[PDB]
């Protein structure tokens, strides 16, 4: 449905506006750098929306004689790439939180907007073309787990951390404090009291991002396998070629079955070609009806069985099919 | 060739090792954060390498009755998505250099490694399956233009900027200096001399990244159009369906031409189906030879022309094709 992706696109725009509003109210330019990062969650909805007005034009057009009945199972692919590509990004970025750990300065406000985002994505998840559903549901599960990360982080971050207490002049041993250490080592004045807070919670986030990454990259892969397999002309999973060939040769009136191509258009519109070699060119229609039946019994319905009638003395050359070109094909 | 992508993969690993070596020698943990960003240039070579040992298995296997002759024109797609996706990343990140501009502390060393990277990518470009070539050449042109950015930046950055001079205690008006302003406003001591350098060169980089992004996103798109078009079963650009149908109906012996599917397997292996409606079921082979000729004259060589022989009184129903199923197909 277009209604669902439309509603969810509207919701994410709402939340980005709320985020810019908080980032400007609090006057914290370090938080306005997520209202530009949700433009990566609006893209996976715009794409699966564009591929909704294209799986309905299922009519033979001079520019595609099957129609765009496939632009569904391509949309999913693009999504399941973007996400996975994007997913590695998180992983890469998680490494930076092990080398130069930053500090979540204002934890009440981050808990606030994180719980708002977690609720809007719980709705975007409870809201949910059979592979666009999957290619977008995974993409909202991603940011939902990201929001659970943000809450469980900024939850035990006001509960535990201590940070610099006496104004702006204290020693932060847990990481290479840029101004505190600079001014404190360039001026030795025996200043006021200090403190030191736990560090077992300074790296309680990148571990959560690594877990979210290993969750998405396993929930996504089977979707990506199925999409690329459909798009590589591969026999579906439910049709065994050797059985089709044994059954075509069992039929009366035929003796050989040349090029036998089977594939999958989209969903369950499976096609099938075959040359064939009848013997008597007058009882052909009964043979073709029988062959269409032995295709219909195997979930394969749109066929094309060209019969190659044998001439005089030419039953010694398969490559010509009795009907061929010259060399290339 | 596998040799070219192998050589280039070896070169990029060499350069990443050189980058970690400099980042550890100089003791500048702000530069080790590019030896993790070149793991995004090794991916587009690993993919177009995996799709090299898969466009050579062009043999009918029970798991694909065309073979993987298409896994070339899919590889390109994945590349031309990754890059474009990745390209938006740059653009997004360029915006951060307009809001909170950072400082290239050590410009001689950055010029050094930037010129080394620019030379290794000039080689990776001069080094260069007809769409993998394009899907990887664009991907090296990307980082080559990135390197030109790094050189022209860190070139007129030692030539112009001034920065803080008298030890570690000066005023930096051009941007919200974190330690200088903090310690200078928390302690009013009438300290030593200061200075102020130009700001027309502090934002001489993100403009270069925006130009590199608008260069890649126009050099990539036509590749992505062609790849997705091949993968959506679309008639090629060189075969006009109306002409094929007019020419099949002009041929003797036939009167109607049912489902006429034409598409593109990969490169130039174009297939074509067609039912057809002959009249006299004894002169069929001549008609089929003529039809194969009027397909061969149009760059379309792998055909399948099923003839539907008319029964008694049934020349009033196209939907049955004289040969059909029941309702669904
Ligand atoms: Zn999102
Ligand atoms: Zn993170
Ligand atoms: Zn690169
Ligand atoms: Zn940049």
Numbering used by the authors:
A (entry chain B), B (entry chain A): 7 to 134, 241 to 441
How do the authors describe this structure?
The SLC39A protein family contains 14 members (SLC39A1 through SLC39A14) that transport zinc ions from the extracellular space and organelles into the cytoplasm, while the SLC30A protein family contains ten members (SLC30A1 through SLC30A10) that transport zinc ions from the cytoplasm into the organelles and the extracellular space. The mammalian SLC30A1 gene was cloned in 1995 and subsequently found to be expressed ubiquitously in the plasma membrane. Interestingly, we found that SLC30A1 is localized to the basolateral membrane of the intestine, where it controls zinc efflux from enterocytes into the circulation. Finally, an integrative analysis of the cryo‐EM structure and site‐specific mutagenesis of human SLC30A1 are performed and a zinc transport mechanism of SLC30A1 unique within the SLC30A family, with His43 serving as a critical residue for zinc selectivity, is identified.
The resulting structure indicates that SLC30A1 forms a homodimer, with each subunit consisting of a TMD with six transmembrane helices (TM1‐TM6), an extracellular domain (ECD), and an intracellular C‐terminal domain (CTD). Among the four zinc‐binding sites, Z2 is the most conserved, with a zinc ion connecting TM2 and TM5 via four coordinated residues (His43, Asp47, His251, and Asp255). Moreover, a zinc ion in Z3 stabilizes the CTD‐CTD interaction via His408 and His413 in one protomer and Cys437 in the other protomer. Finally, the Z4 site resides in a highly negatively charged cavity comprised of His370, His387, Glu420, and Cys433. We also found that Cys291 in the helical domain in the ECD of each protomer forms a disulfide bond, which stabilizes the dimer conformation and is essential for SLC30A1 function.
